[PDB]
Amino acid sequence: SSSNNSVPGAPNRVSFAKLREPLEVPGLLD
Amino acid sequence: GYDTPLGITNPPIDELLDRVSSKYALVIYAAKRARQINDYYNQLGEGILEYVGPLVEPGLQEKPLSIALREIHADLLEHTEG
Amino acid sequence: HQCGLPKLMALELFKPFVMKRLVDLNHAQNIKSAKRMVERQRPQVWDVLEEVIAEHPVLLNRAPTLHRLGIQAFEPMLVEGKAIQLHPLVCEAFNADFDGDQMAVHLPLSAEAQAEARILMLSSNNILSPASGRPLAMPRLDMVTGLYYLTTEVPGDTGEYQPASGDHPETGVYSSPAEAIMAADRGVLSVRAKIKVRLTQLRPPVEIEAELFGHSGWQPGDAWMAETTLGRVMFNELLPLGYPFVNKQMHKKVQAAIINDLAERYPMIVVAQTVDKLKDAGFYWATRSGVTVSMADVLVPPRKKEILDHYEERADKVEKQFQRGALNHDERNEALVEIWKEATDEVGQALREHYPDDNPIITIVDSGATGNFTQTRTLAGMKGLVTNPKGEFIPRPVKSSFREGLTVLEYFINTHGARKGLADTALRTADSGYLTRRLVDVSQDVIVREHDCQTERGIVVELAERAPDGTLIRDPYIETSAYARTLGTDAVDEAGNVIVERGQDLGDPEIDALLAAGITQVKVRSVLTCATSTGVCATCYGRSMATGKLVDIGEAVGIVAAQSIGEPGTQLTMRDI
Amino acid sequence: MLISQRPTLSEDVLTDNRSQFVIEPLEPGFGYTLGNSLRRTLLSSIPGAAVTSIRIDGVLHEFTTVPGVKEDVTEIILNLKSLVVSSEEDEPVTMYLRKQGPGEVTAGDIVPPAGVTVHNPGMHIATLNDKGKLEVELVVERGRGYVPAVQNRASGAEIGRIPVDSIYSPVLKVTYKVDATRVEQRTDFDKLILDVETKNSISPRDALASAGKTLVELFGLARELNVEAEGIEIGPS
Amino acid sequence: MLISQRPTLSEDVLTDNRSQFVIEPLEPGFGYTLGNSLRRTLLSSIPGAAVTSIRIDGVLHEFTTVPGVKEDVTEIILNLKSLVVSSEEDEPVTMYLRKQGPGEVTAGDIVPPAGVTVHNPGMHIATLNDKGKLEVELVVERGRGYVPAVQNRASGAEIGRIPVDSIYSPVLKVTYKVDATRVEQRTDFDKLILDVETKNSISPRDALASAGKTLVELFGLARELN
Amino acid sequence: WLSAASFQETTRVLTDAAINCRSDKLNGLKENVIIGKLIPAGTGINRYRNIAVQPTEEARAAA
Amino acid sequence: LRVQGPREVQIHLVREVQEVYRAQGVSIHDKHIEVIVRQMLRRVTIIDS
Amino acid sequence: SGLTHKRRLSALGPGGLSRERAGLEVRDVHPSHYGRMCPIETPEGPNIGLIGSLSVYARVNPFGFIETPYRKVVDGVVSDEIVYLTADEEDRHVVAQANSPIDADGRFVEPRVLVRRKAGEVEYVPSSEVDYMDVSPRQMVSVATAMIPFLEHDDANRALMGANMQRQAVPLVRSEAPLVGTGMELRAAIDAGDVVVAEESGVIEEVSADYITVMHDNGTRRTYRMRKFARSNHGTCANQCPIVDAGDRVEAGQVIADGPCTDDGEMALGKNLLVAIMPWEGHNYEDAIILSNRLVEEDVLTSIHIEEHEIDARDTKLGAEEITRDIPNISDEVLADLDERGIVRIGAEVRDGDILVGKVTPKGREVRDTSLKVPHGESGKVIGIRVFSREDEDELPAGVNELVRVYVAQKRKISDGDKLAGRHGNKGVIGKILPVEDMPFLADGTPVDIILNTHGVPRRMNIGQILETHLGWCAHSGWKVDAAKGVPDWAARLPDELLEAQPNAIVSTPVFDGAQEAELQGLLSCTLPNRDGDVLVDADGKAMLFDGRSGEPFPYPVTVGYMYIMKLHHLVDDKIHARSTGPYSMITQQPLGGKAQFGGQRFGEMECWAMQAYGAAYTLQELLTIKSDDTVGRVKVYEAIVKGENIPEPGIPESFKVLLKELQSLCLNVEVLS
RNA sequence: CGGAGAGGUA
Ligand SMILES: [Mg+2]
Ligand SMILES: [Zn+2]
């Protein structure tokens, strides 16, 4: 239900999403 | 049959556009009368030259272009076209 | 005739006058001290400035200056802040909005320049479009909504007039608009309820006055009974005293007609005052009308799915026929496009039927305030076909409204047409200015020089060709072909007397009389046949659209024509002939 | 604290029964605070008198037209509804109006009982053209504001009595505006421009005083909770 | 139809900083107008006290940081702006807050002189880790409304003075509701209930009394024509 | 040759005018604007720009 | 112009421009277009010197 | 803005197209761009279609061809093992839509799925033909376009406007995260690099405003230093603040401090405000906005900006120049804020016109004061001075000795004329700032913060703002779905931890997979009371307001809620300019152009056409002769106006004589004949 | 304040 469960110290922002994301967003400066 | 005019909208343009043939004539009319009025205020500083101050009661600080148009609403001036 | 000028921009535009007045009022012995005092903003510089700027017009300009009304003269009154306060009724003339627009300011110095600003370029004297003659200081948007709401009669309203029931006298008959106002402010009467008042300051309609007073007129002070809503009495109290009572709902067209009649029958100052009063009333009654947006307000048609399935069946049949080789690719695409166009039409019709008549969206659309029902269909019903980058339709089509939420593919295929439009808009704004400059250059030497060349040449206007079975059907495009023209000959019908004499403005009464007489063609004076050696004459040119009277003897009509033709260039889409 | 503006009231007469007032130098925001309260006190506070019921002989079951009068019943109701009147007796009174045959029936044609008076003697009521007679009994009261007609469920007293809407307010119509009134590095102050129109039984400046008195009485109610609190003092004249 | 009964005011105390006042009977239609007049007067014209300017020991401007404190000086200003102080004098009066060493710093550590009194000890100011010392001086002053920061240039102040925007509002929230009686005999009237709520600096009764005083002063200029 | 050079193709117009030795009788809106002279239209026509004004005899005596 | 003369070409040009502008719902009185067209038919081509 | 800048794809460059000679076929959206270039985020002017943005999951291969991930599907099963394809490769397969129904069993629930067939042709197709699948329903958009909630409810034009406007918001003095965000705000903030991330796990030892010290798990200490009140390339303020306590334990990759527009490690570009959707007295007319006065008193939308004034002392042919308090002709009173060196004191107040660095240059005494001055319209406080001295063997440019530099910072509050906007392309300037007394207030006495007009929404097809307002009200109020007897059918597909929330809960609605309308209605139907058992907003989402200016309640209910508003970098303090006289050009003796050298507004050619069509010869003549380039005329007009004289007659302009000389220089005998 | 380039607002 939460948004970002990977970042250690992230706020618990809950989401309305219904679909699982197979892959994580790559680095944005790669 | 109109409410009291206020500020620049006094006197009504319709009343003024009956003493002249066209709006450009009104423009030149008022401009030359204002120039004469403003020359009177300066000649008073040194000496009378040829000009007559406001024919009507001038306001406290009313600018020449306003008295010039007040003197045309109450017919007091004459002009000729070229 | 007024504008708001910040109290830090005026202090710089009007610096020399302020220095002069400071020296005159003994606040500074010489010019240098006055200059430095102005540069330090002592508390008295403002007091002298308010007097200095009085009765001194200012020129405001917005770029691009497509036409003449892009520069107008107002009167400055100092305000608080750092922005310029623009009267809401000049926005259409300036084509300005309040999402980040900016404007420039100019100050005429000499007496001739000030007279030109005050008489020629003053905003209150420029109410009609020079290109066509339609008013441009007309209310729009919120004002239209407010007046439209005010001048409405809702059946079965609170305090409505009720006939005698056989036990008590009539209910809802009042002895003055003051008593009706008291009842309304007491919560017992609704401003949009049908009542019967006793009016003595509003002039009765033509028919009522003819059948009731007759004689010569109502002679202000007389009394007559009107059956109307309180809102319509309030509205008609805004119009000039002599105007006959108007009892109608104020659609934008109705207000336009009222303003045009005022302009063509009354002086311009009356028109300015009337439009200001209408502005005040509209801005007052738009707040109380109750127009808002919520997803509950955006209703969806009750049977959209049934229609979509019904037409999806036809699309599937066409696809199967294509599969069996019955038709090629283009035939399949055409069939699908027609099917889905019909589907969109049916969805739009259903959406139009479903909505009540007081919904804020429908009220805003049907009030003439802004928008069209295509946007309503897109928002509530369905978007439909979208165009490929080539220009051809996607046969899918887009099937979800923006209330439901388009999927990823629908959004992507919508982006195509979304971007092509902006690109074309940029290209068109680039293309129009070149044409306008060329037009201004070709015809810059056409100026009115004579009052009348006294020629006999003319042209013939179609002017309501006759019907086959026999009838005088007015030509739809007559306002731009016959009005503001002067006759070059006399009009005689069936051997009768002259209906309209040679040399007549040929306005509404003249054209109506000519049509009643039963004549279809008339010969009018035109610039194409003017006999003046240099320039046109006033009589051949005709009426001045902006002023409404015969054009002057120094009118530069070529530049006016160029700007009139080129100004609506962006609107004209750039869409093998 | 002490306000450094000292607002001032001024009147401009447009008629014997119409005036315009101006409270110029109000502090920002006090234009709307004062304007609506003053308007409502003017329009619904001051007391007066007004007709409340009438009975016209002949018109019992149907109320459309009287035999002998050119006009209809509704016109007579409206004509009496504009009659300016004044009474001292708290209880309802009963006047009478009667004239014989041809002539003009006018407000002056009614004999006023003790206390009741008429301020518009020449107000037209009806014209008799038919050798008929007019017989109608009025009943005046006292009150305040605008009171719609009170339906009569206790009709035993009389069946011909018609209850009429009552304008007990001598003040007929009021409106107000507000603008900005300063140039000294401040264009946010207020002006209160009031247009007051009254009946013939009181002058507008005699109704403004009553409105001020009523509001001063009402705003002393909360003032008494603490009589040593700090506020804004306008100062002396 | 001459209702003979003058309005009377009664109070209900919901809590220390909240109360309801009921005013009845009223002429039909005069409830909302009276209520809104009172509400505007309460929300705009009630005098009070607040802090004007401060001076921390080692900082020269507000765009810096004191050593040893987790909060930048700007955050300290934002925290101090939420103080509530009740003054009784009429000239400026100075306060002093002093702290040294580990521990949180709060308004309870302020030491007001006679007169001014802090009505919310313990809220928050800053936190000092090991080597932080906080010595801040506050200047309390009286007024009404919102007065923006008076920069040092005009007020002939030193470099270390930090002007602060002051809000002199003792009231917190106001609202009203009206009970209207509309019987079929025109014996109608109105009842007004006013919900005032102050920020613990003055009771709602004092605020209502001040509003009444101001309104009585104002409405006395229309009573002079007589 | 001065109104055409400010519109388009300045070089061609100038080179042809120099060969033809053309003289420009300055009479037009663009030319008078360029040379800083009153345009011949509106309030710049002779009948308007050369209007005479004086007080009336009756008003002069009433002074 | 070669076949029907100057009047016919004038009416033709005015009609075409008005049609183009009316297609987009813009109203322009024909006198402006008449001025522009008049400025386009003002010369004669020479044949015999 | 910087992160979006680093991910740009431009077509115009040394070896590419041209900004004018480029047609309308290169400024298009090509079907091959799906998942490799964002179709929404492009400029709005002449660069429309020439500058693009890379997508989120896309990468570039060795030869320079962009690849986008795809999820291999085998035997009708949507499997794992993402494989990166190219446009050329992708053109010979059939890929499916990410937001498609799957049941965790590798078999589509629905029979037909839209798929881009060959040339971006979406088509219903049999389920056995699909060969690949998009990773997420958020794959075509870029980073900035992925932060718009309810994007699918907005039209492309307004979405483009909002995506572009999100990069113009100024950092506010205090940052707060949205209530109705999307989710692409934590990774966007961390990858941008403006936050401080712990290098390695450990325990915080000492945390201060200027430095954090993590005591690593191996006996090593690494102190992080925070950059406070720094300046960005665009004058904004960059300021870092630690968000950890002295006893907390941190992990590698954890956010240890915040940045300019960050709150707890998430982007925060705006503030949450209580909005009403009614027209009001014509003040919010034609896209204008009405604000309360609370946002100014409480500093809700306040910002800090910094200027950079630099001056150096050269060697000069004259020879030598010095910076010092010795400025001739000036009393010590003016030099009060100056110090021994010559620079002003840190913590001083500077106004428009004041010596910041006093110097003198002997122009041949000849000493000439060319001291630095505060530009017109500038003020603030001097917060820092940097001076590089040649005596200290600094890396100075050639031929200089000192490079003193100054910083002045000032806080700007929201005023009338500033530009605000949301995330849905709803922009406008502030028409008026009402006092908080005459503002529409709810039944409990709470005024609204901002008022937005009704006539702007339905025309522009950006209904997403209304849904955002509804959901923001629901989030702020807190809710509790009453599943006493089974969960309501409208909450069947609503994840747990979303069946109940507490006041001020932060939620997220992904860009193309978020809250449905039925869920919004349901949540509006069940919200908690405020303090007393009163619900201020009903099921329709509309409240009953009161008129603060008159006191009467408004006849009809109004839509109210919380939406997220940003403050754009288009403040009115930077757009106000006026002139009467000043610097002039040298060749064509006309006023200069620009707000920074005074300069005057230009009277173009179309304005001349307008003045000619008015028939106003004298105003045009004065404008073109005595106001611009008549050298004697300008001085005479000034001397006449300062006195009570009448304006003289105009002369000959100065741009005609230059043209005559140029024509003569081209070997043309030009003469004026009388 | 003269030129070139880049970005942006209406
Ligand atoms: Mg705009
Ligand atoms: Zn002719």
From TrEMBL, chain B:
GO molecular function: DNA binding; DNA-directed RNA polymerase activity
Biological role: Promotes RNA polymerase assembly. Latches the N- and C-terminal regions of the beta' subunit thereby facilitating its interaction with the beta and alpha subunits.
Record-stated family: Belongs to the RNA polymerase subunit omega family.
Principal EC category: transferase
Superkingdom per UniProt: Bacteria
GO BP: any one term: DNA-templated transcription
Keyword Transcription regulation: no
Any one GO cellular component localisation term in the record: DNA-directed RNA polymerase complex
Reaction equation(s) it catalyzes: RNA(n) + a ribonucleoside 5'-triphosphate = RNA(n+1) + diphosphate
Subunit structure: The RNAP catalytic core consists of 2 alpha, 1 beta, 1 beta' and 1 omega subunit. When a sigma factor is associated with the core the holoenzyme is formed, which can initiate transcription.
Catalytic activity, EC: 2.7.7.6
Gene: rpoZ
Keywords of the record: DNA-directed RNA polymerase, Nucleotidyltransferase, Transcription, Transferase
Name listed for the protein in its UniProt record: DNA-directed RNA polymerase subunit omega
From TrEMBL, chain C:
Sorted UniProt keywords: Coiled coil, DNA-directed RNA polymerase, Magnesium, Metal-binding, Nucleotidyltransferase, Transcription, Transferase, Zinc
GO MF, one example: DNA binding
GO CC term (a single one): cytosol
GO biological process: DNA-templated transcription
Binding site for Mg(2+): 97, 99, 101
Annotated positions binding Zn(2+) 2: 453, 530, 537, 540
Family classification: Belongs to the RNA polymerase beta' chain family.
Role noted for this protein: DNA-dependent RNA polymerase catalyzes the transcription of DNA into RNA using the four ribonucleoside triphosphates as substrates.
Subunit structure: The RNAP catalytic core consists of 2 alpha, 1 beta, 1 beta' and 1 omega subunit. When a sigma factor is associated with the core the holoenzyme is formed, which can initiate transcription.
Protein name stated in the entry: DNA-directed RNA polymerase subunit beta'
Organism: Mycobacterium tuberculosis
Gene name for this UniProt entry: rpoC
Shown segment, full-protein numbering: 439 to 1024 of 1316
